[PDB]
Amino acid sequence: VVGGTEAQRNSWPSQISLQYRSGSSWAHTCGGTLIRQNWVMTAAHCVDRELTFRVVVGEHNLNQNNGTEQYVGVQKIVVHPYWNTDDVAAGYDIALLRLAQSVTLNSYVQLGVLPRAGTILANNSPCYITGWGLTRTNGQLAQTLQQAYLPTVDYAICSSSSYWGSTVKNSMVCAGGDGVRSGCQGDSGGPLHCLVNGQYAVHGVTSFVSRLGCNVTRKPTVFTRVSAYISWINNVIASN
Ligand SMILES: *NC(=O)[C@H](C)NC(=O)[C@H](C)NC(=O)OC(C)(C)C
Ligand SMILES: [Ca+2]
Numbered sequence: 001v002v003g004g005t006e007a008q009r010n011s012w013p014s015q016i017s018l019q020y021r022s023g024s025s026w027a028h029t030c031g032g033t034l035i036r037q038n039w040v041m042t043a044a045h046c047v048d049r050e051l052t053f054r055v056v057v058g059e060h061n062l063n064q065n066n067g068t069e070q071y072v073g074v075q076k077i078v079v080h081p082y083w084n085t086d087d088v089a090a091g092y093d094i095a096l097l098r099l100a101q102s103v104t105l106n107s108y109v110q111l112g113v114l115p116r117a118g119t120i121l122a123n124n125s126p127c128y129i130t131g132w133g134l135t136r137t138n139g140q141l142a143q144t145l146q147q148a149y150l151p152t153v154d155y156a157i158c159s160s161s162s163y164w165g166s167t168v169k170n171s172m173v174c175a176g177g178d179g180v181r182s183g184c185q186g187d188s189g190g191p192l193h194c195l196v197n198g199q200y201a202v203h204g205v206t207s208f209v210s211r212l213g214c215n216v217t218r219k220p221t222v223f224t225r226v227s228a229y230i231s232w233i234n235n236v237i238a239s240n
Contacts, residue, residue, distance in 0.1 A: 001131050002139075002215040003181035004146030009060050009068075012130045014112030014202065015145060017059045018042055018097075018189060020051040028062055028141060031131045031190020033112040033202050037102040039237055040074075041112070042189035043205050043224065044083040044095040053077075055099060058108035061144045062132055068108040073100035078236050080229075091171040093207040093224045096236050112191060112202040117230035119196075121203060123154035127175050127194035129206065129221060133186030137213040141186050150176040150183075150192065153220045163218050171228045173204040177220030184214035192223045202226055 018030040018040070032042035032055065040055055047053065058068035076098040083092040103109055121127075130147045134140060158164055158174035168174060175192055176182050183190075183206045192204030204223025210216045 001129055001133055001142065001146035001148045001182070001187055002135060002137065002184050004135065004142070004148040007130060007145040007147045010107050012145065012147070012191070012193065013108055013110035015130050015191060016040055017056045017062065017132060018046055019054050019056060020049070026054060028132055028186060030186065030188045031133070031206065032097070033191045033205070034103065034109065035112055035114065035233070036237060037105065038099045040097040040099065041205060041233070042095055042097060043093045043207055044079040045085065045088060045093055045207070046189040047077050047079065047095050047097070048085050053097070055097065057103050058106070062141070063143050070103050070109065072103060074098070075100040076240060078240065080232065088208055089167045091169045091224065094205055094229055096233065098240055113199060114230065114233070115196070115201050115203050115227040117227055119227040121152050121154070121173070121194060121196070123152060123157065125152040125194055127152060127192050127203065129175065129183050129187065129190070129192050131183065131187030131190040131206065133188070134184040134214065137184065137215065148181040150181060150221060152194070153177055158220060163220065164222065168222060171225050172207065173223040173225045174220040175204065175223065177218050179215055179217035182215040183209055183221035
């Protein structure tokens with residue numbers, strides 16, 4: 001997250017860190033949202049590589065013991081049938097990970113609330129992006145969970161010429177674009193939390209930023225629109 005502030009430990013308890021086995025250690029590669037005690041929602045592009053993945057819930061500082069972490073293996077990966085690695089602009093950048101065990105919920109580990117199917121946010125809706133991604137374009141990962149206030153940019157504005165044009169689809173949410181705050185590499189797969197009727201719900205899965213940089217004016221961070229995939233999410237969990 002570029003232009004973020006450090007999150008309080010208990011603010012975003014559905015946030016997970018998706019990590020892959022790297023030599024003798026584990027390395028953070030993406031965020032995700034815990035949606036059931038044994039299911040995580042993330043971006044399909046985070047699991048394109050055939051790596052050994054694990055999920056950490058109750059995580060705050062990647063590099064220090066917090067006393068709250070639970071570590072669990074990924075047993076099954078279900079990417080969207082229509083995801084195409086060579087075409088992120090087509091959308092469908094979403095995957096569901098079934099965990100090897102059910103995690104224990106507490107004030108640090110909670111399920112993410114999903115929006116009702118088809119819900120579209122009004123322009124400039126209040127949302128926050130969270131993650132341990134790069135804190136500068138071509139920088140390094142954050143140690144502690146960052147958050148940035150990223151208001152939505154509705155589809156009509158975001159698909160105009162001066163913003164993303166034809167690259168953004170109506171199956172996506174745009175947020176930010178002020179040149180100062182944004183998602184960045186390593187935030188991919190994570191939540192966009194938006195306040196709706198007094199409750200935060202996860203309306204986006206972080207998908208992509210500009211090839212030119214993370215925080216680029218009029219190139220808002222682009223998210224998979226979760227409310228476009230509620231039937232698919234529920235059909236996958238009910239059979240696995
Ligand atoms: N969000 C994304 O697209 C990808 C999958 N994540 C990364 O590229 C990772 C997190 N970046 C990375 O590992 O960061 C350093 C700076 C190379 C350590
Ligand atoms: Ca830790």
